[PDB]
From Swiss-Prot, chain A:
Binding site for Zn(2+): C3, C13, C21, H24
Outcome when changing C13A: Defects in transcription-coupled nucleotide excision repair (TC-NER)
Residues of the full protein shown: 565 to 697 of 709
Name of the protein in its database record: UV-stimulated scaffold protein A
Clinical note on disease: UV-sensitive syndrome 3: An autosomal recessive disorder characterized by cutaneous photosensitivity and slight dyspigmentation, without an increased risk of skin tumors.
Family, similarity comment: Belongs to the UVSSA family.
Protein's cellular compartments: Chromosome
Function: Factor involved in transcription-coupled nucleotide excision repair (TC-NER), a mechanism that rapidly removes RNA polymerase II-blocking lesions from the transcribed strand of active genes. Acts as a key adapter that promotes recruitment of factors involved in TC-NER. Facilitates the ubiquitination of the elongating form of RNA polymerase II (RNA pol IIo) at DNA damage sites, thereby promoting RNA pol IIo backtracking and access by the TC-NER machinery to lesion sites.
Gene: UVSSA
Biased composition (Basic and acidic residues): 28-55
Domain of life: Eukaryota
Subunit structure: Interacts with the elongating form of RNA polymerase II (RNA pol IIo) during transcription stress. Interacts with the TFIIH complex during transcription stress. Interacts with ERCC6. Interacts with ERCC8. Interacts with USP7.
Length: 97, 58
């Protein structure tokens, strides 16, 4: 099976995904023109398209942390995460021994 | 020996070899692997000095 989703470039999606295509969500069977064979699936996609159409001065201490690179560092550098890093490594140390 | 009219025998005591490099490990410790060497002059000039090289657990 193929996603066969209608891309903005006019070509059907050729991604080979078992269940879900990341750029188009769930994968449903489609014909040569990229139309879902199930009429219910066509209606659901139309509803999704309608929903999409409907849709001091200096950075404070909290505002400075509000970004991408800080968020990933906070998750990586955590008391529970570091302990889980050690705890996971302890279990392979038992396997190594 | 005969100490105060009593026959006494000294019993051999087992000890780790000196001046030899040992690598041990403790399953529950902050050191993953520890290297040990109980160094001592061939002529026993002084009590043996133990040096430890270790490896902190991540
Ligand atoms: Zn796709």
């Amino acid at each position: 099976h193929w996603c066969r989703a209608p891309r903005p470039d006019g070509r059907l999606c050729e991604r080979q995904d078992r269940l879900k295509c990341p750029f188009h969500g769930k994968i449903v069977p489609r014909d040569d023109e990229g139309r879902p064979l199930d009429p219910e699936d066509r209606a659901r996609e139309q509803r999704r398209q309608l929903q999409k159409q409907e849709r001091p001065s200096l950075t404070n201490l909290k505002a400075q942390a509000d970004t991408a690179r800080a968020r990933i560092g906070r998750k990586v550098f955590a008391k529970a995460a570091v302990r889980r890093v050690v705890a996971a490594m302890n279990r392979m140390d038992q396997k190594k021994h | 020996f005969i100490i105060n009219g009593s026959e006494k025998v000294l019993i051999a005591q087992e000890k780790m070899a000196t001046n030899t490099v040992y690598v041990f490990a403790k399953k529950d410790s902050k050191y993953a692997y520890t290297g040990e060497c109980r160094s001592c002059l061939e002529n026993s000039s002084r009590p043996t000095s133990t040096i430890w090289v270790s490896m902190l657990a991540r």
